[PDB]
Symmetry: C3
Subunit: 249 residues, 3 copies
């Protein structure tokens, strides 16, 4: 009854999906160029993470982008931000986006190929975070645009960076370069652009060779605290964010 | 019903309060010199943080000191530490001090103008922590004086520095200089003394210009974990600290 | 009713116990050489930590190893890993090992004298962590052997290193050298091999001179968050580890 890979691999216009030897490579893109963040990309990721989670033939996941950026452009006009009922669609799919990600029960490796200023919390939620020398991280579309960082940004960044670095990062428009993200512990390795994906594949293949349950349960036992805090705080954030945003108009 | 700024701005002998365009500058001091930590200062800050939290015209808060230190002197004689009933007055206000601070629903920026050895947890609870080059941080009046660090120090330092740095900091008398505090992630920027307040103002102004509810809710959504652990552990620490102190 | 020191000090074949002025030195070893990790050493540590926790004459604890390594050799054949009932014995004692450790209500100092690749979470759960220049840390016997790091490794390493460093450390076979552990905040001081134990004793003696209840309650107020997450997550990890291991 689960959707096998042959049925969802071609379902998402902003998500290329390729699998070899059980290693699933997820590449986010807009027509083969670097991803432009939209309502569609947001909702596709939520549905796609569900499909990935429920497909037991995925042994390990690599999340990456294409071209010079991971995602450093947004189309705010693709979203409807004016009313509560419009925001409820965002809240419902925004919960699904992060919760479906956390429901994936294999290790997730991020390969951040350049700047990410929209949804940077997604790659940094990964178990292993690899960054190109050119990678940067910024919470672009929230407080710099007068929007509350209430969509999980508020959970992930204090969780990964620490309390003070996390709050400062979210309130001051801070952009972390690759080596700063490494120093702060958000990134595990900084690699040249050409080395990045080969390294992601190397690590993924080694993990995929580990015993079935050891691999799946390693992921499961390691996501406990993030799941606890996300359940405690995510919906609270989203509802406050929606209220503040509706006040704008 | 809330006390307006015109009434509370002049209420507290150790806290100067000045507000311009909704940016509230809170300057702790003893007679215009660097703050000397006392029972009065402790209790005033608790009452003052309540007034600040309840006054919606505060858009953003800057907490700072004056002179060469933020707070690096204490008068232990100003406190009554000998009996349970005396300790309950400290426990009650000590709870209010940190809970009232967390009840403020606008962003709080700390500008640490020099050494802080008493109540350093207060500035480091801020959303943005700026330090002068001369700033230092030490949990002065707890374990070095044979007193349990049970007043919220035990919550804040492991939370912000991490488990092993936090516990070591509290048990060994460690003093963090500004660049070590920066490296440990307790401080966000280290500035020259003359740039410190200008930078705090620049950040505050920028925040104050954000939309009303975005600015308020940013603070709310970001203090969840600290509020959870403070509720779980603060009163426990204070009661144990009182017991050990009375045993002296 | 509690076992005094004169009755448990000689009980354990892999744990030497010496006490001077209330400072208890716990030295893990295999016939006077560096500890080889076994089922015996694991269960002994669980019982030993209980004895130490219940003995009020322990004022401070130093945990250390001997020789070139703290513990960098394991005997997998000493363990029975094939069936659920065998795994229940490991789960039950594995819970006791870490829970008994956390139940100790005096400050715990680790003095990591060299490489630790088995049970490295034990020393890093200490309040003060001192490492020789030659110390290294690695989660040896879990994921590199195709075994889930579900025995507390999953709690401790994300807790002390942070979410991303902790997960990466457990999933990639990473070995931290002493200065990397220091930078990551898992270690507080790095010392020469000759300086290590003298520094542990220096710190322990200083702590031991603090007032009785202040010393005891300092430990108690500082272990809250670790105790909370261990209770939330330890048994979940052990049961999943057991299931995966039996599937082999
Ligand atoms: C860019 C953002 C999301 O993708 C959906 C909205 C809510 C969110 O995730 O913060 C947004 C602000 C438009
Ligand atoms: C300096 C300290 C406080 O201000 C009140 C007392 C309890 C506390 O906060 O730790 C004290 C020990 C006198
Ligand atoms: C080395 C390990 C422990 O000491 C007991 C077993 C379970 C564990 O993970 O603690 C083990 C895998 C043999
Ligand atoms: Ca660091």
């Amino acid at each position: 009854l689960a959707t096998p890979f042959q049925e969802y691999s071609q379902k998402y216009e902003n998500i290329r999906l390729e699998r070899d030897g059980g290693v699933l490579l997820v590449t986010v893109h807009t027509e083969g160029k670097s991803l432009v963040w939209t309502s569609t990309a947001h909702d596709e990721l939520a549905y796609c993470f569900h499909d990935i989670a429920c497909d037991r033939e995925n042994k390990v996941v690599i999340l990456t982008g294409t071209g010079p950026s991971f995602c450093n452009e947004i189309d705010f006009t693709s979203f409807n931000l004016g009313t509560p009922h419009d925001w409820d669609e965002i809240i419902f799919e925004g919960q699904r986006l992060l919760n479906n990600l956390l429901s994936i029960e294999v290790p997730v490796i991020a390969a951040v190929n350049g700047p990410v200023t929209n949804a940077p919390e997604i790659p940094v939620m990964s178990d292993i975070v690899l960054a190109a020398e050119s990678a940067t991280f910024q919470d672009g579309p929230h407080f710099p645009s007068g929007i509350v960082p209430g969509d999980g940004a508020h959970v992930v960044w204090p969780h990964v960076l620490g309390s003070n670095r996390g709050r400062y990062f979210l309130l001051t428009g801070q952009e972390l370069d690759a080596r700063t993200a490494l120093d702060y512990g958000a990134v595990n390795e900084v690699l040249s652009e050409q080395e990045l994906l080969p390294r992601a594949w190397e690590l993924a293949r080694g993990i995929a060779e580990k015993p079935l349950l050891a691999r799946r349960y390693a992921r499961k036992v390691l996501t406990r605290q993030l799941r606890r805090v996300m359940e405690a705080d995510l919906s609270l954030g989203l509802a406050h964010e929606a209220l503040a945003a509706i006040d704008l108009g």
